Amino acid sequence: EPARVRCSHLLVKHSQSRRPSSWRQEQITRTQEEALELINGYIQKIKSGEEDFESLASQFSDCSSAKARGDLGAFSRGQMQKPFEDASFALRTGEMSGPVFTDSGIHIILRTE
Numbered sequence: 001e002p003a004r005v006r007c008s009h010l011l012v013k014h015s016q017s018r019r020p021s022s023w024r025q026e027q028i029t030r031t032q033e034e035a036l037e038l039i040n041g042y043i044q045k046i047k048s049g050e051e052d053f054e055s056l057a058s059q060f061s062d063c064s065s066a067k068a069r070g071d072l073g074a075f076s077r078g079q080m081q082k083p084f085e086d087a088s089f090a091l092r093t094g095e096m097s098g099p100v101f102t103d104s105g106i107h108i109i110l111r112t113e
């Protein structure tokens with residue numbers, strides 16, 4: 001395992017998120033069921049080729065990293081919420097996670113380095 005990995009992600013928050021607001025929405029009103037529906041919708045469009053991971057994140061990610069087309073830069077273990085960390089370090093470079101759940105909300109993650 002490398003010291004650090006580089007990943008991009010797409011976050012979908014819900015009303016029960018630890019901080020139910022984002023750059024794109026003053027109050028997150030969607031239900032967590034709806035948030036996971038969106039994430040799985042995104043996964044299937046990216047698998048089919050109909051959508052690009054990084055374009056989706058720049059438009060709809062509730063993380064401010066959307067301005068970076070989803071890129072979070074490099075990080076080591078011990079910095080991110082543990083479920084996020086574990087999924088990231090389990091990916092191969094170029095691979096995409098399934099749904100990842102954290103206190104911030106629901107993620108799909110793409111390891112780039």
Ligand SMILES: Cc1cccc(C[C@H](COP(=O)([O-])[O-])NC(=O)c2cc3ccccc3s2)c1
Pocket residue numbers: 009011018019063064065068071072073080081084102103104105
């Ligand atoms: C577990 C987790 C991983 C990444 C992001 C979040 C959401 C978190 C905001 O969700 P919140 O704290 O409101 O519940 N964003 C960040 O930690 C980061 C944003 C950026 C922007 C640019 C570059 C690096 C970073 S790290 C949570």
